[PDB]
Design a protein around this ligand. Structure first.
Ligand SMILES: [Mg+2]
Ligand SMILES: [Zn+2]
Lengths: 104, 158, 135, 100, 39, 1111, 94, 263
DNA sequence: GCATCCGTGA
DNA sequence: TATAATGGGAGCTGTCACGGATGC
């Protein structure tokens, strides 16, 4: 299909969760030794996808013969790493917070 | 076609107009010292006098050029529209003219020198105010020009 | 200058709603209120009483129907919030929209008027003609 | 770490360049051109063995059981296929430039 | 530019905006550019 | 050759040291040569004295000291270190309860030392601290723009020295004071100071209606204590009004010398303006438990007096150079030092709490880190600390004399309107009206005048000769602008017989205003016209014949002059081209009298009168910041007797002690075949033949081999998959040999880096299987020559790990630098300019036979178009050309001072003397006048140039005196139809060259986030197609070109890949796809909790992420 | 200027339509390898090489000249797209 | 979070903002699970709101959150979207493009109005893929990879590739542009004429349109790829095809300076 | 009905 | 893991204009 109209609208919490591929529970980014992403972190591969194309974290499934398959060990789906520019995460707040755009 | 320093030709009329303006200036000062006219009116009369004087020496330059030296480089370039305008040529041959203070106020004394004769450090310093103000005006103008242009583009784009 | 000024006079303000859903003081495009008025007057309903409204180029550019253009101009936050609240759809009428989207602008060679033009040689044209004549 | 905004001068090493992608495409196409000079069977053996098909590299027992031959037979025809590939390569010198 | 009736599909608004804008840096007893923006 | 100087003006004083604004400032700041006990309280000393004692245990300051630099300047430049000295501070920790005293000298880190020429070396790079002009501290009174008959009193201290208090008279009648955006009745603050209604009534009562507005009963009813608490409640809402907190806050805000500092200059200005005396730099004091007033009452009195119209009270001009001062290197550095010291003091106070309260030493209590951090921050990341301009000696010399209104504690460019940018009447002799940048920075960035010098208070002073009676003394008085306005100052060119004024009427200045005055009325007189203009501006001969706007460009572009191998001083000088080479330390001179012992290319050895043998090393082919080669050549010979101050070696861009910014060429002013159309320039190939405008340029390349988790990076001669042809010029270690010629693509330094772990594609598996060759463990990272660059490698520097004297940054095993030099001939696209503001790129290089030539057979060099002259109104180049013709045939050069020049008649004389040599030679050689000369003379007399009836020689001389000659076209042989101005002009090759600026890209690196091409030549980036270019393509109506720009050529991944593949395959380019940056926009809008949906005509969602972002 | 650009501007009601026509025709010539051309061998645009005169590789020049000849028919809805593509592929294989 | 050339790490401010948010959130959840007093919980919640605000739009309310030891405000999402440097104006309404170049302009008098002098090397890089195709067509290279690896080194470049380049660019045009672009004639189409030297040669008559002179001005070259873009440039954007101002209708490219003087 | 701060833009 | 200790420190000033909401 060809793009015709472009719509913008408010996003419900349920919609935000619908976008999200997982929740980030930790402030950690990557490991200070291995340089690999921390689990439940901002760079976590379990959430936002694989760093390398069609290869999981631990490297159990390294090729395209597995696609859409989520490794049981590291928990990283095997697909094109381009998805790391795409897949959203989320953060569940203990208390609601007002969007400053609709306040100020 | 070339340009020598003699190619800027100071008219004989110049000195005459200058001396006339001098005696006129003296008359005005005399009229002021006897309390006939205020400082304002005196200043205005001096400015007007020097403006008309400037016009006269300009016309003198271009008439001398037209009649005596029709193929003169400055004259040719100005007439054909190749380069230059009457005021710049006037600055090259006749007087540089009146200059203004940073406040916009004009100095009572004009620059009697031309660029061919060369100026005096005081005259040069007096002109520098105007030059600087002009440069600043240009620089500050470009930005607003661009902003306006972009506003217009955005409103008219569809 | 008449083009720009034309874009300056683009908006009107409602003096009386009539039978419409519009409100007193509400500002909208002249085209829309004229279409609304001709739709109401053909329906046998009291038309909207409006007033010509002149606004400067900035406000007029920010007041456009396209939220992509308005957001790409200035006051991105304001524009985007009001648009998201309104659930606005950008129909990609103007140039800026299609530029941002990276599409072919609706002008020049991208104009629907000249866009669908076809070219064919007489040989192929005739061959195709004979092909369609045998069906 | 230091802030990126202090990032416009920093290249992207990850995504393949147009030149690289084009080179990989020409590589695949030239490889198919060279594999077309074999029989479909001995080409299929190499495609199954080196993982050009399905992505996995098959053992000699699997290709042999697939074609219905002995693993020695499949290894031998793999060898002769590779041999014809080497001869065709020595002749046409096509795949040398892709060796970097 | 062509001294003939304009071709359909010509982008008029941009040409207008540019036509007004380009001389702008030249605008100087005169009100000038601030007057232009004021208008 | 012979040097003939003109002008009648005798300057009684020489130009001051030009770098003194830097040198003396920093010297005064450090006081390194002053024994500690004898140090005045200023600069670093003032910082220590202001910070200490630290009260809380009591830590006090005794004295400091600066050690010797750990490394010499050259070695610092080499090793990327900073030229600096260790700073030690003797401190005694005193326990006031015990009486215990522990004294120790603590090491506070290093401070950058200034070099001899007034610059710095920071991390190996030469830098310059630009002086900053700002509003001088003090008390000012300015007209209130709202209420005409009312005024605003402003009390201004130094930057970051405390707030700006604003006294104003409100419409209700009460006097208001404004501090930190808060406004309160001044009466309260007056009551806090201990003032009573009686005292205010008697003091201010002279001015009738204001004092009643000052009267508030409720305030006078309460004692200063309750008024203090009240004021604290007004200033600090929500904070409990504890009395001690109120005292602390109010004292800290006003009376605290630590938190609040008026300038010493501010102190003086306040004392002078208000007519009072300050006990300190604070507006008030805390004495005997209470607050005592200093400033506020006199200022309030003055305000009321100015409002009332009491004579003797004036409003202040804030643009006046008496109200504006200069913060030099020493002051800025001292400020940052004071900040770091304050932070260190906070650390110390924090350390006096924790730990053992008994055993502590000054060493334990002091952490030097904040200080080091502050100073380093200043010299590294500050705006006023600028990368030094070394292009030519004059570049740096001018750079050091720069005055900026920008920087920290200064104007924003957008905060600056006409007023700040304007040339004030007080700029005379102080700030050059000519030389300022052309652009947005105009008027904000300026230059110090030649005779101008900054005083101790920070104000710029200019020299004036005392005139007593009608006699002009030789004594000079440097005056501030405020002091300058007091007298009547005659011009420098006023007629003089001996020391007496010879004119009945003289031209003078009263408060800057020009006036005609009698010799009895002359109090002072200008020293020289030179004082009006900066150094660069003073280098433009016939400056009075040039329009200011073009002279600006002349000045500015002299700075851009590239040092040439053959570089020579101008035939027409201003007389300043010697001294400039002296003050910029590039040129080498003899210390005392003596005989030269040795002369080499590397060094010069001199034996002085003392008998001591002094060896001077010469800097040879050293790369400056701009890449221009700085090199010294010996000007003397073995056994030559020299005196004190005599030239030994010539610096870069200098000829025999005179400044050489370019070459003297033979120029003809005339249009040539549209090749000089619009400022373009045509030059002779003869210039390239004799190596005129040829300059050496050095570029430095650098690479690092570090430690990786994938294994070490190695610098080696072993590079995978390379032939011997590629490795030819590399030595055993992998570094290119010295003397080799490198071109684009060549390897300067071989390097191998372990490949990132990756699974080889099935294609690679099959390929490897076919060729039977294992994939190497390492990849080729080798440093190569960037496109468009190259040359001969003149140097290599290698620093490893484990070798003595070197430690790199953590992780780095080794670092290699390669210095490559190139000899650049003049070529099409290079920029040339003269001193008068005539600039142009060379658009054509003709062979010698195509060049217009003199009848004797001498071809010209440069052909300039006359169309540049009239509109630009710079006539100085013309006169320079005429006198240059005279000087060409007379074999001599000239010195024409600024505004006292060689005038027309004298040039006519010299031109006649020249014509005798030019012609009489011919007539003696047995040659008569040419036919073409006859025709040209006919047309010339048609023009009215020569008087009809005279002999051909007389007419040719009449032409020659006009500076015009007969010129033959080299192509035709036929003469030009008229006489053309030809002569010697001084032209420079500017730093802007095509070799540097040419760039082209097909495809290359893309940005991380946006996936758009990079930018800059170094990164091999693409050209920016902006909003305006899009407007261009839109207005043209080209949709597909624009779409190509938006997609296929940028940021559309699939699109650009498919496009390149299609082009290399010969196929036409494919339909473009969605730009990646739009996807980035969508996702960045999602992070803002805004749902952005692309819809079709059916309003059904369209997925541009192709299912990858959806679960 | 392009040779006979004025007649070309005369052919169409809008210049952009001319652009579209030229571009599309050029794409036809490129895809079909110029063997679908309406030009006679002596009308073929020529290019000077070191060897000698060859065919002009530029398809746009060809398209403009072909347009000038008048042997090209342009307009809207002349023929369904797939039918045109397939018939041209039948007459001039790729 | 990416590793730069020197093995050092660089990261966006959004990461630090997110970390702030997560830390304050988790501390809030722990404070709630431990039943902290209402004061502490109030303060924590307020800090959480301050954090979310700082993330979405920084400096919008209260003091802008800065990284330690720096006065520079972190870059929030609002700061990324809006502004002159914002996503829209910087990366959307305009882009840096491929197949483009830049150099110093010089006046060719000899050029026809529709022509421009183009340096050899510049054109070799700009047309490079076409040149690879042509070189593969002729006997200069076995294939594209070989030709490109051949062009990589300058000393590996022979004289036939220049002729092939001449074959490549024949009939095609390029776009010259000078900043600032104040109207549609700030970009114009010219037939490239290969020249020795590093300078772009510009026809005199168009100088007035670009407001270009020879005092050291520079211009940018762009190469339209598709036959469509090339048609657009050759017809609509060609210099000789626009002789009149779209503004006043008067002649734009007309005799000036030297020309007027001579005539 | 009108003065009073703040917010966004080069 | 145990002497006792119980509201924080920088702001920082020579821009111009209209769109709000306040709110004098
Ligand atoms: Mg220019
Ligand atoms: Zn796994």
């Amino acid at each position: 299909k060809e793009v015709r109209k472009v719509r913008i609208a408010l996003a419900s919490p349920e919609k935000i969760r619908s976008w999200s591929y997982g929740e980030v529970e930790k402030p950690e980014t990557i490991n200070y030794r291995t340089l690999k992403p921390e689990r439940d972190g901002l760079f976590d591969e379990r959430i936002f996808g694989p760093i390398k194309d069609y290869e999981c974290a631990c490297g159990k499934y390294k090729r395209q013969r597995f696609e859409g398959k989520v490794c049981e060990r590291c928990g990283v789906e095997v697909t094109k790493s381009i998805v790391r520019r795409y897949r959203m995460g989320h953060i569940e707040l203990a208390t609601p917070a007002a969007h400053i755009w609709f306040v100020k | 076609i070339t340009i020598g320093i003699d190619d800027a030709v100071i008219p004989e009329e110049k000195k005459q107009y200058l001396e006339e303006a001098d005696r006129k200036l003296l008359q005005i000062e005399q009229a002021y010292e006897m309390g006939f006219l205020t400082d304002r009116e005196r200043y205005d009369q001096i400015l007007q006098l020097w403006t008309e004087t400037t016009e006269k020496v300009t016309q003198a330059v271009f008439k001398n050029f037209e009649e005596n030296y029709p193929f003169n480089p400055l004259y040719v370039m100005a007439q054909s529209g190749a380069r230059g305008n009457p005021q710049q040529i006037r600055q090259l041959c006749g007087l540089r003219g009146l200059m203004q203070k940073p406040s916009g106020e004009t100095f009572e004394v004009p620059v009697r020198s031309s660029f061919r004769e060369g100026l005096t450090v005081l005259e040069y310093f007096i002109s520098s105010h105007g030059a600087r103000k002009g440069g600043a005006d240009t620089a500050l103008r470009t930005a607003d020009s661009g902003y306006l242009t972009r506003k217009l583009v955005d409103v008219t784009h569809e | 200058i008449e083009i720009v000024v034309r874009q300056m006079m683009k908006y009107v303000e409602v003096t009386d709603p009539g039978d419409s859903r519009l409100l007193e003081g509400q500002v909208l495009e002249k085209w829309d209120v004229e279409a609304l008025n001709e739709r109401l007057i053909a329906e046998g309903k009291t038309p909207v009483a409006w007033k010509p409204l002149l606004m400067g180029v900035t406000k007029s550019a920010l007041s456009t129907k396209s939220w992509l253009s308005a957001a790409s101009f200035q006051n991105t936050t304001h524009v985007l919030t009001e648009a998201a609240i309104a659930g606005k759809k950008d129909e990609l009428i103007g140039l800026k929209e299609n530029v941002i989207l990276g599409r072919l602008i609706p002008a020049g060679t991208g104009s629907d008027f000249v866009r669908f033009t076809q070219v064919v040689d007489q040989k192929t044209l005739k061959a195709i003609e004979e092909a369609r004549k045998e069906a | 770490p230091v802030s990126l905004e202090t990032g416009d001068f920093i290249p992207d090493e990850h995504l393949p360049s147009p030149v690289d992608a084009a080179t990989q495409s020409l590589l695949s196409e030239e490889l198919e051109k060279a594999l077309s000079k074999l029989s479909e069977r001995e080409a299929m053996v190499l495609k199954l063995r080196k993982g050009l098909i399905d992505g996995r590299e098959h053992t000699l027992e699997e290709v042999g059981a697939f074609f219905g031959v002995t693993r020695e037979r499949i290894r031998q025809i793999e060898n002769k296929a590779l041999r014809k590939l080497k001869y065709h390569e020595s002749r046409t010198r096509k795949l040398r430039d892709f060796l970097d | 530019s062509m001294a003939r009736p304009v071709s359909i599909g010509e982008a008029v608004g941009i040409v207008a905006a540019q036509s007004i804008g380009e001389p702008g840096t030249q605008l100087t007893i005169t009100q000038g550019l601030p007057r232009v923006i004021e208008l | 050759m012979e040097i003939k100087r003109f002008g009648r003006i005798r300057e009684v004083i020489p130009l001051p040291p030009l770098t003194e604004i830097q040198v003396e400032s920093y010297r005064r700041a450090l006081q390194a040569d002053v024994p500690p006990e004898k140090r005045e309280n200023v600069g670093i000393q003032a910082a220590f004295r202001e910070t200490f004692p630290i009260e809380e245990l009591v830590l006090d300051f005794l004295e400091y000291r600066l050690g010797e630099p750990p490394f010499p300047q050259d070695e610092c430049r080499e090793k990327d270190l900073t030229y600096q000295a260790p700073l030690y501070a003797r401190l005694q920790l005193i326990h006031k309860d015990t009486g215990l005293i522990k004294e120790d000298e603590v090491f506070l880190g290093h401070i950058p030392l200034m070099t001899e020429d007034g610059s710095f070396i920071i991390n190996g790079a030469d830098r310059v601290i630009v002086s900053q002009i700002h509003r001088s501290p003090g008390v000012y009174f300015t007209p209130d723009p709202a209420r005409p008959g009312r005024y605003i009193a402003s009390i201004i201290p130094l930057p970051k020295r405390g707030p700006w208090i604003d006294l104003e008279v409100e419409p209700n009648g009460v006097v208001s004071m404004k501090v930190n955006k808060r406004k309160f009745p001044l009466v309260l603050l007056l009551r806090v100071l201990g003032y009573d209604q009686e005292t205010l009534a008697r003091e201010l009562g002279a001015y009738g209606e204001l004092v009643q507005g000052l009267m508030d009963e409720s305030v006078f009813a309460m004692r200063p204590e309750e008024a203090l608490i009240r004021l604290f409640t007004l200033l600090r809402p929500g904070d409990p009004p504890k009395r001690d907190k109120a005292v602390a806050y109010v004292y800290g805000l006003i009376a605290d010398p630590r938190r609040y500092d008026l300038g010493e200059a501010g102190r003086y200005k306040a004392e002078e303006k208000l007519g009072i005396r300050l006990s300190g730099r604070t507006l008030a004091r805390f004495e005997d438990g209470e607050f005592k007033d200093e400033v506020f009452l006199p200022t309030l009195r003055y305000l009321f007096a100015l409002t009332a119209g009491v004579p003797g009270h004036e409003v202040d001009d804030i643009d006046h150079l008496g109200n504006r001062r200069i913060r030099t290197v020493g002051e800025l550095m001292t400020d940052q030092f004071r900040v770091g010291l304050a932070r260190l003091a906070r650390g110390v106070r924090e350390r006096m709490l924790m730990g053992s309260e008994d055993s502590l030493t000054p060493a334990k209590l002091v952490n030097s880190r904040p200080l080091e951090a502050a100073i380093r921050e200043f010299f590294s990341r500050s705006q006023l600390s600028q990368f030094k301009d070394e292009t030519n000696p004059l570049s740096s010399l001018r750079h050091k004399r720069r005055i900026s209104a920008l920087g920290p504690g200064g104007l924003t460019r957008e905060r600056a309107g006409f007023d700040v940018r304007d040339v004030h009447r007080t700029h005379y002799g102080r700030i050059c009206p000519v030389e300022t940048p052309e652009g947005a920075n105009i008027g904000l960035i300026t230059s110090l005048a030649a005779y101008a010098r900054v005083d101790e208070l920070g104000f710029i002073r200019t020299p004036y000769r005392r005139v007593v009676g009608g006699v002009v003394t030789d004594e000079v008085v440097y005056m501030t602008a405020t002091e300058e306005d007091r007298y009547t100052i005659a011009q420098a060119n006023t007629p003089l017989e001996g020391n007496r004024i010879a004119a009945e009427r003289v031209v003078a200045r009263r408060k800057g205003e020009p006036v005609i005055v009698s010799p009895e009325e002359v109090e002072f007189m200008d020293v020289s016209p030179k004082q009006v203009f900066s150094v660069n501006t003073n280098l433009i001969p016939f400056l009075e014949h040039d329009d200011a706007n073009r002279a600006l460009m002349g000045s500015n572009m002299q700075t851009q002059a590239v040092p040439l191998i053959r570089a020579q001083a101008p035939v027409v000088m201003t007389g300043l081209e010697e001294r400039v080479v002296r003050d910029s330390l590039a040129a080498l001179y003899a210390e005392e009298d003596g005989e030269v012992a040795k002369v080499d290319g590397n060094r010069i050895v001199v034996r002085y009168e003392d008998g001591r043998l002094v060896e001077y090393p010469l800097r040879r082919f050293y790369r400056s910041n701009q890449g221009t080669a700085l090199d010294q050549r010996p000007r003397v010979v073995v056994g030559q007797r020299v005196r004190k101050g005599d030239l030994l070696a010539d610096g870069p861009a200098s000829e025999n002690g005179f400044l050489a910014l370019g070459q003297n060429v033979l120029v003809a002013i005339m249009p040539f075949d549209g090749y000089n159309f619009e400022d373009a320039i045509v030059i002779s190939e003869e210039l390239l033949k004799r190596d005129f405008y040829t300059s050496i340029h050095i570029e430095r390349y650098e690479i690092e081999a570090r430690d990786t988790k994938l294994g070490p990076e190695r610098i080696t001669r072993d590079i995978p998959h390379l032939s011997e042809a590629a490795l030819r010029d590399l030595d055993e270690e992998g570094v290119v040999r010295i003397g080799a010629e490198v071109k684009p693509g060549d390897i300067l330094v071989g390097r191998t880096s372990f490949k990132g772990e990756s699974e080889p594609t099935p294609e690679e598996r099959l390929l490897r299987s076919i060729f039977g060759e294992k994939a190497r463990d390492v990849k080729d990272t080798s440093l190569r020559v960037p496109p468009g660059e190259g040359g001969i490698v003149v140097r290599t520097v290698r620093l490893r790990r484990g070798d003595p004297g070197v430690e790199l940054k953590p992780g780095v095993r080794e670092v290699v630098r390669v210095y490559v030099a190139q000899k650049r001939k003049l070529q099409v696209g290079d920029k040339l300019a003269n001193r008068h503001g005539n600039k142009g790129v060379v658009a054509k290089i003709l062979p010698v036979e195509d060049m217009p030539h003199l009848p004797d057979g001498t071809p010209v060099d440069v052909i300039l178009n006359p169309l540049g002259v009239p509109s630009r109104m710079n006539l100085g180049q013309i006169l320079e050309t005429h006198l240059g013709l005279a000087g060409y045939f007379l074999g001599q050069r000239y010195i024409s001072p600024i505004f006292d020049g060689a005038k027309e008649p004298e040039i006519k004389e010299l031109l006649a003397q020249a014509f005798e040599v030019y012609f009489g030679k011919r007539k003696g050689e047995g040659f008569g006048v040419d036919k073409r000369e006859v025709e040209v003379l006919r047309r010339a007399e048609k023009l009215g140039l020569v008087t009809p009836g005279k002999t051909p020689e007389e007419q040719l001389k009449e032409l020659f005196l006009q500076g015009k000659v007969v010129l033959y076209d080299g192509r035709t042989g036929e003469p030009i139809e008229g006489p053309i101005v030809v002569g010697q002009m001084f032209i420079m090759k500017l730093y802007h060259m095509v070799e540097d600026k040419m760039h082209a890209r097909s495809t290359g690196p893309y940005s991380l986030i946006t996936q758009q091409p990079l930018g800059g030549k170094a990164q091999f980036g693409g050209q920016r197609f902006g909003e305006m270019e899009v407007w261009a393509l839109e207005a043209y109506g080209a949709a597909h070109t624009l779409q190509e720009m938006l997609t296929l050529k940028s940021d559309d991944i699939e699109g650009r890949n498919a496009a390149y593949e299609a082009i290399i395959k010969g196929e036409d380019v494919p339909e473009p796809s969605v730009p990646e940056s739009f996807r980035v926009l969508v996702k960045e809008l999602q992070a803002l909790a805004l749902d952005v949906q692309t819809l079709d005509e059916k309003d059904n969602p369209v997925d541009i992420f192709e299912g990858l972002a959806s679960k | 200027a392009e040779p006979g650009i004025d007649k070309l501007f005369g052919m169409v009601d809008s210049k952009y339509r001319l652009t579209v026509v030229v571009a599309k025709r050029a794409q036809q010539l490129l895809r079909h390898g110029f063997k679908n051309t309406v030009l006679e061998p002596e009308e073929r645009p020529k290019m000077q090489t070191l060897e000698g005169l060859f065919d002009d590789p530029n398809a746009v020049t060809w398209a403009m000249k072909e347009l000038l000849t008048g042997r090209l028919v342009f307009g809207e809805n002349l023929v369904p797209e797939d039918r045109l593509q397939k018939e041209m592929e039948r007459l001039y294989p790729v | 979070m990416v590793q730069v050339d020197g093995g050092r790490f660089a990261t966006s401010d959004l990461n630090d903002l997110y970390r702030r948010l997560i830390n304050r959130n988790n501390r809030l959840k722990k404070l709630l699970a431990q039943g902290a007093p209402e004061i502490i919980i109030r303060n924590e919640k307020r800090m959480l709101q301050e954090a979310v605000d700082a993330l979405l739009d920084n400096g919008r309310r209260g003091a802008p959150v800065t990284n330690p030891g720096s006065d520079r405000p972190l870059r929030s999402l609002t700061d990324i979207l809006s502004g002159k440097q914002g996503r829209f104006r910087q990366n959307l309404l305009g882009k840096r493009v491929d197949y483009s170049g830049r150099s110093v302009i010089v006046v060719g008098p000899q050029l026809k109005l529709h022509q421009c002098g183009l340096p050899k090397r510049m054109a070799l890089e700009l047309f490079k893929p076409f040149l690879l195709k042509k070189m593969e067509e002729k006997g200069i290279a076995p294939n594209v990879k070989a030709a490109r690896r051949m062009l990589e080194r300058q000393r590996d470049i022979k004289d036939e590739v220049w002729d092939a380049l001449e074959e490549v660019i024949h009939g095609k045009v390029v776009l010259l542009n000078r900043a600032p672009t104040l109207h549609r004639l700030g970009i114009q189409a010219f037939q490239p004429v290969l020249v020795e030297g590093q300078s772009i040669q510009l026809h005199p008559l168009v100088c007035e349109a670009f407001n270009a002179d020879f005092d050291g001005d520079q211009m940018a070259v762009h190469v339209p790829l598709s036959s469509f873009a090339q048609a657009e440039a050759r017809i609509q954007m060609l210099s000789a095809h626009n002789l009149l101002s779209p503004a006043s209708g008067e002649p734009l490219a007309k005799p000036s300076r030297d020309i007027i003087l001579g005539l």
